[PDB]
């Protein structure tokens, strides 16, 4: 998170950590067993980290869960980061409680204008490299449809949305990707790809979670 600020301890429950070795990408709890991410995380070996704060230190409210599988979109494209999103299932299940507690799935598209928070552990410099031990949080809106195709032409499918700010100076940033946009307590965004960081009319991009509501509940119904 580019212009961000810091979260407070477990005041995203919902925000979990993925790692193979190191912190990579930030997922999105959605019930005791699962996770949403953006598919383009997808590796092997993972594992869930919950309950986290500073990610360099044990501070008393993790869970570390291997993943026993991952699923990635059917239609995934890496190329245009078309269906940037996959899902994440636990060897066991997590205890859910204050600070480890499942996001809602959005019912309905959320709209131009609505504000939602925007966190992860990623690069927070714009120009040059500096990544956090502790969450990082962003309040950013949703961006205009026709502003993000302007923004990014021919790049901009329906199943991706912009947020941020078109002056720049707040975004997400790598080591992001994969980690919640939640409007009003609904999961709405999967933090996804942009050009660069913070920069001027160039701001994040994440997969729209609405369009892939049926595909979730259908998937961790027979997973
Ligand atoms: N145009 C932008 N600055 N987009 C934000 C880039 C963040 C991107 N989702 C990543 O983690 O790599
Ligand atoms: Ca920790
Ligand atoms: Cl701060
Ligand atoms: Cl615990
Ligand atoms: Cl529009």
Same mark, same amino acid.
Not at 83 to 88: A, C, E, G, Q, R
Not at 100 to 110: D, E, G, K, N, R
Not at 147 to 155: E, H, I, N, R
Not at 177 to 206: D, R
């Given at each position: 998170?580019?212009?961000?600020?810091?979260?407070?301890?477990?005041?995203?429950?919902?925000?979990?950590?993925?790692?193979?070795?190191?912190?990579?990408?930030?997922?999105?709890?959605?019930?005791?067993?699962?996770?949403?991410?953006?598919?383009?995380?997808?590796?092997?070996?993972?594992?869930?980290?919950?309950?986290?704060?500073?990610?360099?230190?044990?501070?008393?409210?993790?869970?570390?869960?291997?993943?026993?599988?991952?699923?990635?979109?059917?239609?995934?494209?890496?190329?245009?980061?078309?269906?940037?999103?996959?899902?994440?299932?636990?060897?066991?299940?997590?205890? &859910?409680?204050?600070?480890? %507690?499942? @996001?809602?799935?959005?019912? /309905? #598209?959320? *709209? +131009?204008?609505?504000?939602?928070?925007? !966190?992860?552990?990623?690069?927070?410099?714009?120009?040059?490299?500096?990544?956090?031990?502790? &969450?990082?949080?962003?309040? %950013?809106? @949703?961006?205009?449809?026709? /502003? #993000?195709? *302007? +923004?990014?032409?021919?790049?901009?499918? !329906?199943?991706?949305?912009?947020?941020?700010?078109?002056?720049?100076?707040?975004?997400?940033?790598?080591?992001?990707?994969?980690?919640?946009?939640?409007?009003?307590?609904?999961?709405?965004?999967?933090?996804?790809?942009?050009?660069?960081?913070?920069?001027?009319?160039?701001?994040?991009?994440?997969?729209?979670?609405?369009?892939?509501?049926?595909?979730?509940?259908?998937?961790?119904?027979?997973?």
């Amino acid at each position: 998170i580019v212009g961000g600020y810091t979260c407070g301890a477990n005041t995203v429950p919902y925000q979990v950590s993925l790692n193979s070795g190191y912190h990579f990408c930030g997922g999105s709890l959605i019930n005791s067993q699962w996770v949403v991410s953006a598919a383009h995380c997808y590796k092997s070996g993972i594992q869930v980290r919950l309950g986290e704060d500073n990610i360099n230190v044990v501070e008393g409210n993790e869970q570390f869960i291997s993943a026993s599988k991952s699923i990635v979109h059917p239609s995934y494209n890496s190329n245009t980061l078309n269906n940037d999103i996959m899902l994440i299932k636990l060897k066991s299940a997590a205890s &859910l409680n204050s600070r480890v %507690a499942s @996001i809602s799935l959005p019912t /309905s #598209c959320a *709209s +131009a204008g609505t504000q939602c928070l925007i !966190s992860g552990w990623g690069n927070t410099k714009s120009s040059g490299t500096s990544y956090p031990d502790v &969450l990082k949080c962003l309040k %950013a809106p @949703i961006l205009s449809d026709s /502003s #993000c195709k *302007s +923004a990014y032409p021919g790049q901009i499918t !329906s199943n991706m949305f912009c947020a941020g700010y078109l002056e720049g100076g707040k975004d997400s940033c790598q080591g992001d990707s994969g980690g919640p946009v939640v409007c009003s307590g609904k999961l709405q965004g999967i933090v996804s790809w942009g050009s660069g960081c913070a920069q001027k009319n160039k701001p994040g991009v994440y997969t729209k979670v609405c369009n892939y509501v049926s595909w979730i509940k259908q998937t961790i119904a027979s997973n």
